Design a protein around this ligand. Structure first.
Ligand SMILES: Cc1cc2nc3c(=O)[nH]c(=O)nc-3n(C[C@H](O)[C@H](O)[C@H](O)COP(=O)(O)OP(=O)(O)OC[C@H]3O[C@@H](n4cnc5c(N)ncnc54)[C@H](O)[C@@H]3O)c2cc1C
Ligand SMILES: CC(=O)OCC(=O)[C@@]1(O)[C@H](C)C[C@@H]2[C@@H]3CCC4=CC(=O)CC[C@]4(C)[C@@]34O[C@H]4C[C@@]21C
Length: 523
């Protein structure tokens, strides 16, 4: 499959519609299902198309922190926050560029949440996770909401259809004993809500192939399910929330997107730009394709990565064995700083230096979390009883590494990182449990043996794609809208530009613009 557009007159030379619906939704992420619910709940027949054999995609893998501020959820917690406070934070970071979509995101949040919580399968709650930048309107505790843990039993036959967490999915496993949490809860509840409307069809192994145009309006889509080809009519429109280009190496090389497909934490084979491609075909503009939701990734034996989040020890060096960033930085800034510092391989990979403080464990949350033994067997990590020998085994300058570590250890005993101010932020301190020092983020690495872990530039999906308006309408280069086509999530170029403002902005933008697209289609 390439994603070439059909004219209906052309297809009318032999074929005819194999199905029909008011709202066709391509994908089954947070956005897709939120747009599907918005449409089905108010009477529009909806068909949801999931390419793989599991609903949720990267949204299922997520922790389902959602940046929808100023809502009834934050009020129940008595949060010192408001729609206007949130608007200020976004303006202070992104500027006036895309200010209309900024306004729409922050202004629509409450309505999205009111509608979804109204369903008996959906309820959210505030959970503390700090916003990620020092700027007016920042929330040091955060303002993001999560779905409640869900007993799989409460959604029947939909639980087995939800994509399992990364610690199970990249190892041929299903959901474990632990109840549906984070992204698994988000998708389980939204599938249940969407089903409960009695106006929606949920399909797996149904792949978008081409949009169908008639007189320059999108009227439906070519789909591939069970060997054969289907032509699905869409009376009001098609919503494309099938993710980004994260799994398509060629589209990334072309755009100049840093990182690699094999490093992305998107489900292997799922998000390959199918929708973005299909949208360009029918005349859609694109932006920001070189941009991603970046994160450090712990390189794996199989050459893929694990999301490294909530760092609470060690330090990181370039190929010169010298710290170049605040290891406790939020993951998108961490990653962008690796990219900036890279002189043809000096920083990608970087090397995370740690000791036996965590009995051989890397002092951070790795998702998924491979056993140290497997890393050491494979040579992604390296271990030694001395820094001299560790530098030998890793090809790091031994004089430099040893200076870097003596200097870091000095700052740990002092309590301040003169070079990179590590631990001096509410995010940095959020993951650090108090030790016996003056700074919980700085812990001396003098306990043997010492380990070196290769860190690459991973991602949580791309954020470049089709240009959209405040209603998720796909636009041509001239600014005109392509009637019948709407895009959201990572299929749509982020209003957030080169910024990850705080936890849940991906799912948050996805859910608001998916919702707004349905509202537009309701007309
Ligand atoms: C471990 C982890 C934690 C994260 N935590 C959070 C968090 O807490 N909060 C947050 O906001 N973000 C978080 N993120 C990021 C977030 O998961 C993604 O950026 C977001 O879910 C992207 O949603 P999407 O709709 O763009 O993609 P997805 O959720 O992946 O949805 C895309 C779906 O479309 C399907 N699809 C693709 N092509 C086609 C086609 N042609 N036809 C039909 N279907 C197709 C795919 O199979 C997939 O099922 C996290 C990421 C990871 C890896
Ligand atoms: C799972 C459990 O029992 O507790 C462990 C945890 O806290 C998690 O693993 C949860 C699965 C969600 C949580 C957070 C939620 C907020 C968030 C939103 C984003 O968009 C990016 C990802 C983060 C920063 C998140 O770090 C991931 C993963 C952790 C740390």
């Amino acid at each position: 499959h390439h994603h070439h557009s059909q004219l209906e007159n052309l297809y009318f030379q032999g074929s005819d519609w194999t199905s029909e619906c008011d709202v066709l939704v391509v994908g089954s992420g947070g956005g897709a299902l939120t747009g599907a619910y918005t449409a089905a709940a108010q009477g529009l027949t909806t068909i949801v198309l999931e390419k793989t054999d599991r609903f949720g995609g990267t949204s299922a893998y997520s922790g389902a922190s959602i940046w929808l501020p100023g809502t009834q959820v934050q009020e129940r917690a008595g949060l010192p926050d408001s729609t206007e406070n949130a608007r200020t934070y976004l303006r202070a970071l992104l500027g006036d560029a895309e200010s209309e979509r900024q306004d729409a995101y922050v202004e629509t949040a409450p309505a999205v949440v009111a509608l979804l919580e109204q369903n008996p399968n959906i309820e959210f709650e505030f959970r503390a996770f700090p916003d990620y930048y020092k700027a007016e309107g920042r929330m040091d505790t955060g303002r993001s909401i999560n779905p409640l843990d869900l007993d799989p039993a409460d959604i029947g036959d939909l639980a087995g259809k939800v994509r399992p967490e990364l610690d199970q999915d990249r190892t041929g496993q299903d959901h474990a004993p632990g109840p549906m949490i984070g992204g698994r809860a988000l998708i389980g509840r939204l599938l249940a809500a969407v089903q409960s409307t009695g106006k929606a069809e949920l399909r797996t192994e149904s792949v978008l192939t081409s949009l169908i145009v008639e007189d320059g309006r999108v009227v439906g889509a070519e789909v591939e399910s069970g060997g054969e080809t289907q032509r699905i009519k869409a009376n009001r429109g098609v919503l494309m929330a099938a993710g980004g280009i994260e799994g398509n190496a060629e589209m990334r090389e072309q755009a100049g997107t840093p990182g690699k497909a094999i490093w992305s934490m998107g489900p292997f084979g799922a998000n390959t730009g199918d929708a973005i491609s299909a949208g360009i075909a029918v005349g859609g503009a694109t932006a920001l394709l070189d941009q991603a939701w970046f994160c450090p990734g712990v390189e794996q034996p199989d050459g893929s990565a694990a999301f490294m989040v909530g760092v609470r020890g060690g330090l990181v060096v370039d190929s010169a064995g010298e710290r170049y960033l605040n290891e406790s930085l939020p993951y998108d800034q961490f990653g962008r700083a690796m990219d900036a510092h890279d002189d043809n391989g000096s920083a990608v990979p970087s090397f995370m230096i740690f000791d036996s403080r965590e009995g051989g464990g890397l002092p951070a949350i790795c998702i998924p979390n491979t056993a140290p033994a497997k890393h050491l067997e494979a040579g992604t990590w390296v271990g030694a009883d001395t820094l001299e020998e560790l530098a030998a085994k890793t090809g790091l300058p031994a004089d430099a590494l040893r200076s870097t570590v003596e200097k870091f250890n000095d700052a740990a005993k002092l309590g301040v990182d003169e070079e990179f101010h590590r631990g001096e932020d509410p995010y940095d301190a959020f993951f650090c449990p108090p030790n016996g020092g003056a700074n919980a983020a700085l812990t001396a690495i003098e306990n043997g043996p010492f380990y070196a872990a290769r860190i690459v530039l991973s991602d949580l999906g791309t954020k470049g794609g089709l240009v959209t308006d405040v209603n998720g309408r796909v636009l041509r280069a001239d600014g005109s809208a392509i009637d019948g086509l709407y895009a959201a999530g990572n299929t749509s170029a982020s209003l957030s530009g080169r910024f990850y403002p705080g936890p849940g902005v991906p799912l948050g933008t996805a859910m608001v613009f998916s919702y707004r697209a349905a509202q537009d289609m309701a007309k």
